């Protein structure tokens, strides 16, 4: 099919904001590590 953005000549001069498939992205979201305690190295202090 055709690209849903460029319907006619608008910026084919510099080719900047005229056409782009910006309506088809696998939307990625802020991913965090599953942690329930930030003490895995501090606990390995062994002794003081």
């Amino acid at each position: 099919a055709h690209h849903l953005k460029r319907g006619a000549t608008m910026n084919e001069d510099s080719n900047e904001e005229e056409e782009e498939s910006e309506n088809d992205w696998e939307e990625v979201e802020e991913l965090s590590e599953p942690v329930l305690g930030d003490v895995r190295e501090s606990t390995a202090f062994s002794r003081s």
């Binding site: 900047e16 498939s21 088809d24 992205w25 939307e27 990625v28 802020e30 991913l31």
Partner: protein, 108 residues
């Protein structure tokens, strides 16, 4: 190590924004982009302001990454690097989404 230093964690090549030639550099807490072969950066966003990022999958003539900022902004990055376009796309994706909630400044 994430100490407000310009430590580029990931160096991405031939990245185009709206087809504009450039290079994408992922630092410790900020992601910046500057035209390829140019010393002056034009795009600079903090992970803190970015909420998420979407990646334009195969099937298109260009593999890309759009940055969705929780401030109401979006940055379309086209990976025009024939060598590692798709590969860089996912590496950037991961690194970015991994750091995204780590520097989240939306707690305000």
């Amino acid at each position: 190590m994430a100490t407000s230093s310009e430590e580029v964690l990931l160096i991405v090549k031939k990245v185009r924004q709206k087809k504009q030639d450039g290079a994408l550099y992922l630092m410790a807490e900020r992601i910046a982009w500057a035209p390829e072969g140019k010393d002056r950066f034009t795009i600079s966003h903090m992970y803190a302001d970015i909420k998420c990022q979407k990646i334009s999958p195969e099937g298109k003539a260009k593999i890309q990454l759009q940055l969705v900022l929780h401030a109401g902004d979006t940055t379309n990055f086209h990976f025009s690097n024939e060598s590692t376009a798709v590969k860089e796309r996912d590496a950037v994706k991961d690194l970015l989404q991994q750091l995204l909630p780590k520097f989240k400044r939306k707690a305000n």
